Amino acid sequence: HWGYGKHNGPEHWHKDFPIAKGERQSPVDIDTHTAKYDPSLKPLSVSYDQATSLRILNTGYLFQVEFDDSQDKAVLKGGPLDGTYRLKQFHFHWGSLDGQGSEHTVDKKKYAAELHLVHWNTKYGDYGKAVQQPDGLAVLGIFLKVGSAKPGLQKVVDVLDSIKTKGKSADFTNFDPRGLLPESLDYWTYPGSLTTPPLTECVTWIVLKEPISVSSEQVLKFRKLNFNGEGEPEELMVDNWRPAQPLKNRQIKASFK
Ligand SMILES: NS(=O)(=O)c1c(F)c(F)c(S(=O)(=O)CCO)c(NC2CCCCCCC2)c1F
Ligand SMILES: [Zn+2]
């Protein structure tokens, strides 16, 4: 099965998922000098006041916080997007060391982690149909750098010991994702893909320019998760990021400058 190791990591995924070598794969390096300011882009509309978090889950590759997406409670609109995208979940990718962990890079810089808020286009009715479409998902990506703590992240960090191993979940109600956002909503955007199998090319990526600051202790706690299930040898969950992929025939657009 796929994963992040020597024998089943990103460089092997193409054998099961040939789209790994496709024309719109993610993540990518964001060359800030060659990204084009697009005056016709709109401000993002991030409408998260009615978000209903449900559950946090160790998938065996990362952890994710899941929301009620059975109605338009928390939605993403505007920016490069046509229509209404419903928040389904968020998750992170992170490293074994503070200078790696992000999927996107900025002028080749890697951050300690990257937060992904996954949304699906409500014109397709359910998320499983939306993944079959070139404009089915919108993922909002936010970089994490190590510095001062992020208070809005601490509820997430504190529950991780209850979901140490693959397949564990825990109630995670009443969490407000607005606490994970930086001050600015300046962004880059480009068409891309899931960054894990099945690597489907169904994502409009919106990557915020401003990272959030998390403490060394918050990220250390991410690295205490396990890829393995309970009752199996411990494999620390670190380095669950895909490296930058070829940009090919794509332009990254900037909402700013
Ligand atoms: N980085 S990412 O946002 O492209 C991404 C993941 F890294 C990721 F691991 C997941 S996953 O845990 O579900 C593993 C399977 O790819 C999703 N989740 C979305 C993509 C999965 C298909 C259904 C669409 C909505 C969830 C996912 F979108
Ligand atoms: Zn992701």
Side-chain angles (χ1 to χ4, degrees), residues 142-154 156-163 165 167 169-174:
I142 302 176
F143 297 120
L144 279 61
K145 67 177 187 181
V146 176
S148 68
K150 191 69 167 169
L153 181 62
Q154 190 61 34
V156 172
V157 163
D158 273 339
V159 77
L160 295 183
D161 81 299
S162 77
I163 60 150
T165 50
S169 67
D171 294 316
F172 203 71
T173 54
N174 306 287

mmCIF file of all heavy atoms in Angstrom, residues 142-174, unseen atoms left out:
data_model
loop_
_atom_site.group_PDB
_atom_site.id
_atom_site.type_symbol
_atom_site.label_atom_id
_atom_site.label_comp_id
_atom_site.label_asym_id
_atom_site.label_seq_id
_atom_site.Cartn_x
_atom_site.Cartn_y
_atom_site.Cartn_z
ATOM 1 N N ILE A 142 -2.182 26.861 4.154
ATOM 2 C CA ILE A 142 -1.599 27.857 5.053
ATOM 3 C C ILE A 142 -0.324 27.236 5.590
ATOM 4 O O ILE A 142 -0.322 26.147 6.148
ATOM 5 C CB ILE A 142 -2.616 28.186 6.186
ATOM 6 C CG1 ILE A 142 -3.924 28.696 5.587
ATOM 7 C CG2 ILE A 142 -2.008 29.144 7.195
ATOM 8 C CD1 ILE A 142 -5.045 28.971 6.607
ATOM 9 N N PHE A 143 0.756 27.993 5.444
ATOM 10 C CA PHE A 143 2.034 27.533 5.985
ATOM 11 C C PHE A 143 2.140 27.722 7.499
ATOM 12 O O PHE A 143 1.591 28.679 8.007
ATOM 13 C CB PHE A 143 3.156 28.340 5.327
ATOM 14 C CG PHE A 143 3.202 28.105 3.839
ATOM 15 C CD1 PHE A 143 3.046 29.152 2.938
ATOM 16 C CD2 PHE A 143 3.538 26.852 3.356
ATOM 17 C CE1 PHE A 143 3.164 28.909 1.555
ATOM 18 C CE2 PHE A 143 3.656 26.612 1.977
ATOM 19 C CZ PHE A 143 3.460 27.644 1.070
ATOM 20 N N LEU A 144 2.847 26.797 8.135
ATOM 21 C CA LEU A 144 3.166 26.921 9.553
ATOM 22 C C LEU A 144 4.675 27.099 9.693
ATOM 23 O O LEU A 144 5.475 26.276 9.260
ATOM 24 C CB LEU A 144 2.732 25.667 10.334
ATOM 25 C CG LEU A 144 1.269 25.550 10.729
ATOM 26 C CD1 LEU A 144 0.363 25.536 9.510
ATOM 27 C CD2 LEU A 144 1.032 24.313 11.570
ATOM 28 N N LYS A 145 5.066 28.205 10.366
ATOM 29 C CA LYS A 145 6.468 28.381 10.735
ATOM 30 C C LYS A 145 6.540 28.286 12.246
ATOM 31 O O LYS A 145 5.593 28.529 12.979
ATOM 32 C CB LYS A 145 6.995 29.736 10.265
ATOM 33 C CG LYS A 145 6.394 30.935 10.931
ATOM 34 C CD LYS A 145 7.076 32.229 10.417
ATOM 35 C CE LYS A 145 6.648 33.478 11.154
ATOM 36 N NZ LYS A 145 7.333 34.662 10.586
ATOM 37 N N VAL A 146 7.695 27.864 12.755
ATOM 38 C CA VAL A 146 7.921 27.732 14.194
ATOM 39 C C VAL A 146 8.348 29.066 14.792
ATOM 40 O O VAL A 146 9.330 29.664 14.389
ATOM 41 C CB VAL A 146 8.928 26.605 14.421
ATOM 42 C CG1 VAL A 146 9.275 26.473 15.901
ATOM 43 C CG2 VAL A 146 8.359 25.304 13.900
ATOM 44 N N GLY A 147 7.624 29.490 15.812
ATOM 45 C CA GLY A 147 7.948 30.710 16.525
ATOM 46 C C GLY A 147 7.092 30.755 17.775
ATOM 47 O O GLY A 147 7.176 29.849 18.601
ATOM 48 N N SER A 148 6.227 31.781 17.886
ATOM 49 C CA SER A 148 5.295 31.825 19.010
ATOM 50 C C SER A 148 4.145 30.855 18.777
ATOM 51 O O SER A 148 3.762 30.613 17.634
ATOM 52 C CB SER A 148 4.731 33.189 19.161
ATOM 53 O OG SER A 148 3.892 33.460 18.048
ATOM 54 N N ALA A 149 3.560 30.351 19.864
ATOM 55 C CA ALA A 149 2.390 29.452 19.811
ATOM 56 C C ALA A 149 1.226 30.075 19.026
ATOM 57 O O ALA A 149 0.973 31.291 19.070
ATOM 58 C CB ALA A 149 1.911 29.163 21.226
ATOM 59 N N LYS A 150 0.437 29.206 18.424
ATOM 60 C CA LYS A 150 -0.846 29.596 17.861
ATOM 61 C C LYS A 150 -1.935 29.177 18.829
ATOM 62 O O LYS A 150 -2.237 27.983 18.957
ATOM 63 C CB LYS A 150 -1.040 28.905 16.517
ATOM 64 C CG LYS A 150 -2.214 29.429 15.693
ATOM 65 C CD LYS A 150 -2.003 30.884 15.143
ATOM 66 C CE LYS A 150 -2.998 31.313 14.092
ATOM 67 N NZ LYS A 150 -2.860 32.772 13.858
ATOM 68 N N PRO A 151 -2.575 30.122 19.553
ATOM 69 C CA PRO A 151 -3.549 29.735 20.579
ATOM 70 C C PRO A 151 -4.696 28.908 19.971
ATOM 71 O O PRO A 151 -5.161 27.984 20.609
ATOM 72 C CB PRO A 151 -4.027 31.106 21.074
ATOM 73 C CG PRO A 151 -2.854 31.993 20.828
ATOM 74 C CD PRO A 151 -2.284 31.557 19.492
ATOM 75 N N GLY A 152 -5.112 29.251 18.748
ATOM 76 C CA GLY A 152 -6.248 28.609 18.129
ATOM 77 C C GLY A 152 -5.967 27.182 17.701
ATOM 78 O O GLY A 152 -6.866 26.483 17.317
ATOM 79 N N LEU A 153 -4.699 26.769 17.748
ATOM 80 C CA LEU A 153 -4.277 25.411 17.414
ATOM 81 C C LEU A 153 -4.222 24.528 18.662
ATOM 82 O O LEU A 153 -4.175 23.297 18.556
ATOM 83 C CB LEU A 153 -2.908 25.425 16.727
ATOM 84 C CG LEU A 153 -2.279 24.091 16.258
ATOM 85 C CD1 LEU A 153 -3.095 23.346 15.195
ATOM 86 C CD2 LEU A 153 -0.868 24.283 15.772
ATOM 87 N N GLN A 154 -4.207 25.133 19.862
ATOM 88 C CA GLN A 154 -3.877 24.304 21.011
ATOM 89 C C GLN A 154 -4.966 23.268 21.295
ATOM 90 O O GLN A 154 -4.633 22.162 21.704
ATOM 91 C CB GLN A 154 -3.563 25.185 22.229
ATOM 92 C CG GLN A 154 -2.975 24.362 23.406
ATOM 93 C CD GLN A 154 -1.666 23.682 23.059
ATOM 94 O OE1 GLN A 154 -0.850 24.215 22.297
ATOM 95 N NE2 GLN A 154 -1.363 22.550 23.691
ATOM 96 N N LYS A 155 -6.251 23.543 21.015
ATOM 97 C CA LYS A 155 -7.258 22.497 21.235
ATOM 98 C C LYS A 155 -6.992 21.243 20.378
ATOM 99 O O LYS A 155 -7.274 20.117 20.791
ATOM 100 C CB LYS A 155 -8.659 23.085 21.011
ATOM 101 C CG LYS A 155 -9.189 23.695 22.308
ATOM 102 N N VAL A 156 -6.446 21.469 19.186
ATOM 103 C CA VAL A 156 -6.117 20.374 18.307
ATOM 104 C C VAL A 156 -4.928 19.593 18.904
ATOM 105 O O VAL A 156 -4.938 18.374 19.028
ATOM 106 C CB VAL A 156 -5.730 20.890 16.920
ATOM 107 C CG1 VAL A 156 -5.192 19.730 16.070
ATOM 108 C CG2 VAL A 156 -6.895 21.581 16.241
ATOM 109 N N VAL A 157 -3.852 20.314 19.272
ATOM 110 C CA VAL A 157 -2.654 19.654 19.801
ATOM 111 C C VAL A 157 -3.029 18.820 21.036
ATOM 112 O O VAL A 157 -2.514 17.712 21.204
ATOM 113 C CB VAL A 157 -1.595 20.740 20.190
ATOM 114 C CG1 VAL A 157 -0.502 20.212 21.118
ATOM 115 C CG2 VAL A 157 -1.082 21.368 18.904
ATOM 116 N N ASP A 158 -3.932 19.352 21.903
ATOM 117 C CA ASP A 158 -4.160 18.694 23.172
ATOM 118 C C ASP A 158 -4.925 17.390 23.039
ATOM 119 O O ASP A 158 -4.811 16.570 23.960
ATOM 120 C CB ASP A 158 -4.803 19.683 24.099
ATOM 121 C CG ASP A 158 -3.718 20.505 24.816
ATOM 122 O OD1 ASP A 158 -2.523 20.058 24.902
ATOM 123 O OD2 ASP A 158 -4.044 21.585 25.153
ATOM 124 N N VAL A 159 -5.646 17.179 21.913
ATOM 125 C CA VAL A 159 -6.425 15.954 21.766
ATOM 126 C C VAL A 159 -5.588 14.873 21.078
ATOM 127 O O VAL A 159 -6.026 13.742 20.990
ATOM 128 C CB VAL A 159 -7.734 16.274 20.986
ATOM 129 C CG1 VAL A 159 -7.476 16.425 19.493
ATOM 130 C CG2 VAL A 159 -8.832 15.227 21.154
ATOM 131 N N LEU A 160 -4.395 15.192 20.538
ATOM 132 C CA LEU A 160 -3.680 14.235 19.685
ATOM 133 C C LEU A 160 -3.289 12.953 20.446
ATOM 134 O O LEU A 160 -3.232 11.875 19.849
ATOM 135 C CB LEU A 160 -2.425 14.863 19.055
ATOM 136 C CG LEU A 160 -2.758 15.995 18.088
ATOM 137 C CD1 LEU A 160 -1.479 16.506 17.451
ATOM 138 C CD2 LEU A 160 -3.645 15.531 16.976
ATOM 139 N N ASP A 161 -3.002 13.048 21.749
ATOM 140 C CA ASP A 161 -2.670 11.821 22.484
ATOM 141 C C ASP A 161 -3.849 10.842 22.521
ATOM 142 O O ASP A 161 -3.616 9.657 22.734
ATOM 143 C CB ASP A 161 -2.188 12.132 23.906
ATOM 144 C CG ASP A 161 -3.372 12.380 24.809
ATOM 145 O OD1 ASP A 161 -4.111 13.331 24.516
ATOM 146 O OD2 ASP A 161 -3.570 11.586 25.791
ATOM 147 N N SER A 162 -5.094 11.290 22.269
ATOM 148 C CA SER A 162 -6.249 10.401 22.246
ATOM 149 C C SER A 162 -6.437 9.737 20.875
ATOM 150 O O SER A 162 -7.246 8.812 20.755
ATOM 151 C CB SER A 162 -7.467 11.148 22.697
ATOM 152 O OG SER A 162 -7.960 11.983 21.662
ATOM 153 N N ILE A 163 -5.656 10.174 19.867
ATOM 154 C CA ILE A 163 -5.754 9.587 18.536
ATOM 155 C C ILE A 163 -4.343 9.207 18.036
ATOM 156 O O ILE A 163 -3.984 9.394 16.894
ATOM 157 C CB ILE A 163 -6.507 10.491 17.535
ATOM 158 C CG1 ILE A 163 -5.833 11.839 17.346
ATOM 159 C CG2 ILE A 163 -7.967 10.646 17.915
ATOM 160 C CD1 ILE A 163 -6.076 12.380 15.955
ATOM 161 N N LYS A 164 -3.561 8.611 18.950
ATOM 162 C CA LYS A 164 -2.151 8.370 18.653
ATOM 163 C C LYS A 164 -1.953 7.495 17.417
ATOM 164 O O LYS A 164 -1.032 7.748 16.629
ATOM 165 C CB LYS A 164 -1.438 7.718 19.850
ATOM 166 C CG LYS A 164 0.072 7.574 19.628
ATOM 167 C CD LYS A 164 0.790 6.927 20.863
ATOM 168 C CE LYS A 164 2.250 6.591 20.673
ATOM 169 N N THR A 165 -2.799 6.489 17.240
ATOM 170 C CA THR A 165 -2.542 5.425 16.260
ATOM 171 C C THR A 165 -3.624 5.416 15.163
ATOM 172 O O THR A 165 -4.746 5.952 15.318
ATOM 173 C CB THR A 165 -2.426 4.033 16.925
ATOM 174 O OG1 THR A 165 -3.573 3.888 17.767
ATOM 175 C CG2 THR A 165 -1.172 3.991 17.760
ATOM 176 N N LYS A 166 -3.237 4.857 14.026
ATOM 177 C CA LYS A 166 -4.069 4.718 12.842
ATOM 178 C C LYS A 166 -5.441 4.174 13.170
ATOM 179 O O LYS A 166 -5.563 3.140 13.816
ATOM 180 C CB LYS A 166 -3.375 3.793 11.829
ATOM 181 C CG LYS A 166 -4.188 3.554 10.517
ATOM 182 C CD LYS A 166 -3.451 2.706 9.524
ATOM 183 C CE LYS A 166 -2.971 1.403 10.145
ATOM 184 N N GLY A 167 -6.469 4.916 12.739
ATOM 185 C CA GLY A 167 -7.840 4.457 12.911
ATOM 186 C C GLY A 167 -8.522 4.960 14.190
ATOM 187 O O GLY A 167 -9.746 4.765 14.375
ATOM 188 N N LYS A 168 -7.764 5.590 15.088
ATOM 189 C CA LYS A 168 -8.393 6.213 16.250
ATOM 190 C C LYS A 168 -9.085 7.506 15.828
ATOM 191 O O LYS A 168 -8.495 8.291 15.086
ATOM 192 C CB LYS A 168 -7.394 6.403 17.392
ATOM 193 C CG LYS A 168 -6.834 5.101 17.968
ATOM 194 C CD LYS A 168 -6.169 5.292 19.304
ATOM 195 N N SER A 169 -10.233 7.780 16.452
ATOM 196 C CA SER A 169 -10.941 9.033 16.339
ATOM 197 C C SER A 169 -11.378 9.517 17.719
ATOM 198 O O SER A 169 -11.491 8.745 18.696
ATOM 199 C CB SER A 169 -12.075 8.929 15.338
ATOM 200 O OG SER A 169 -13.061 8.065 15.813
ATOM 201 N N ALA A 170 -11.774 10.787 17.785
ATOM 202 C CA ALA A 170 -12.286 11.378 18.998
ATOM 203 C C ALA A 170 -13.260 12.476 18.626
ATOM 204 O O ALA A 170 -13.165 13.100 17.546
ATOM 205 C CB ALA A 170 -11.146 11.936 19.823
ATOM 206 N N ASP A 171 -14.262 12.633 19.487
ATOM 207 C CA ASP A 171 -15.155 13.756 19.293
ATOM 208 C C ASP A 171 -14.311 15.025 19.244
ATOM 209 O O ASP A 171 -13.357 15.259 19.997
ATOM 210 C CB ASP A 171 -16.278 13.740 20.339
ATOM 211 C CG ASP A 171 -17.296 12.562 20.278
ATOM 212 O OD1 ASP A 171 -17.784 12.161 19.140
ATOM 213 O OD2 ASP A 171 -17.616 11.992 21.377
ATOM 214 N N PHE A 172 -14.750 15.950 18.388
ATOM 215 C CA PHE A 172 -14.054 17.196 18.259
ATOM 216 C C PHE A 172 -15.044 18.275 17.847
ATOM 217 O O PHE A 172 -14.894 18.912 16.815
ATOM 218 C CB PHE A 172 -12.830 17.068 17.338
ATOM 219 C CG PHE A 172 -11.785 18.134 17.585
ATOM 220 C CD1 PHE A 172 -11.025 18.095 18.752
ATOM 221 C CD2 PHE A 172 -11.571 19.188 16.707
ATOM 222 C CE1 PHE A 172 -10.045 19.037 18.970
ATOM 223 C CE2 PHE A 172 -10.582 20.160 16.933
ATOM 224 C CZ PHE A 172 -9.829 20.068 18.088
ATOM 225 N N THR A 173 -16.020 18.501 18.699
ATOM 226 C CA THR A 173 -17.077 19.467 18.448
ATOM 227 C C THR A 173 -16.637 20.851 18.896
ATOM 228 O O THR A 173 -15.764 21.006 19.748
ATOM 229 C CB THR A 173 -18.390 19.043 19.117
ATOM 230 O OG1 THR A 173 -18.159 18.815 20.505
ATOM 231 C CG2 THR A 173 -18.967 17.841 18.413
ATOM 232 N N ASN A 174 -17.334 21.850 18.361
ATOM 233 C CA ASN A 174 -17.187 23.225 18.789
ATOM 234 C C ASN A 174 -15.788 23.803 18.610
ATOM 235 O O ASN A 174 -15.403 24.702 19.367
ATOM 236 C CB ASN A 174 -17.688 23.429 20.216
ATOM 237 C CG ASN A 174 -19.109 22.939 20.341
ATOM 238 O OD1 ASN A 174 -20.038 23.569 19.853
ATOM 239 N ND2 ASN A 174 -19.248 21.809 21.016
#
